[PDB]
C-alpha cells in the first residue's frame, strides 16, 4: 500500500510507501473512513490492533485507509472493507466530504489527511483480519454518540472529529 501526496488543492503530486509515510512529520495525504451499519441499524465499531503503526489498540469507526492511485474513493473502501472484516458492503455513500485533519498519536506518529467519510451498509458475515482488528462491537449509534460526548479520548481522533460535525452527524443517524 501507498498514500497519494497532495499539494496545496487535493492535486496529487506523488506516492510513498504507507509505513514510511506516516511519521512523527507525515505529510499532507490521500485518505478515507467509512462507517458501516447493518441490516438492523447497529454500528459497527472496531479496535485497531496492536500491530497498526498509527493509533494501535485504539477505539475508532468501521474502517479507515489510504485510497490508492488510480483508484476511487469508494473502491478503496470495498477494498479495505473485505481486506480488514472480510464483509461485503453496499454501495458507500458520501456523508463528509471535506472532512481534513491532522492528529498525533501517543507514540507521536501523526495523521495529516484529506480524508472524505462514507457509511454504507454490511451485506455479509464479518471474517476478522486479526492482523488489523483485534475487537469489535455492534452498538446502537445513540450510545457511540453519547460516548464520544463524554469521553472523546477513548475514541480516534478522526472518529470524534467526524461524528461532532453537525451535519455529518445526521447523515449518519438517517443510516439507523
Ligand atoms: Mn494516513
Redesign the pocket.
Known sequence: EH?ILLNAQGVPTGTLEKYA??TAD?RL?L?FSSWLFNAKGQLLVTRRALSKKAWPGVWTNSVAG?PQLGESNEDAVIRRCRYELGVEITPPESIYPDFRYRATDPSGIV?N?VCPVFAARTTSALQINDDEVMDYQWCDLADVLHGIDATPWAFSPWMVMQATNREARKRLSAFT
Do not use: G, K, L
Open positions: 498514500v509515510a506516516h507525515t495525504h485518505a489510504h495523521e489527511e
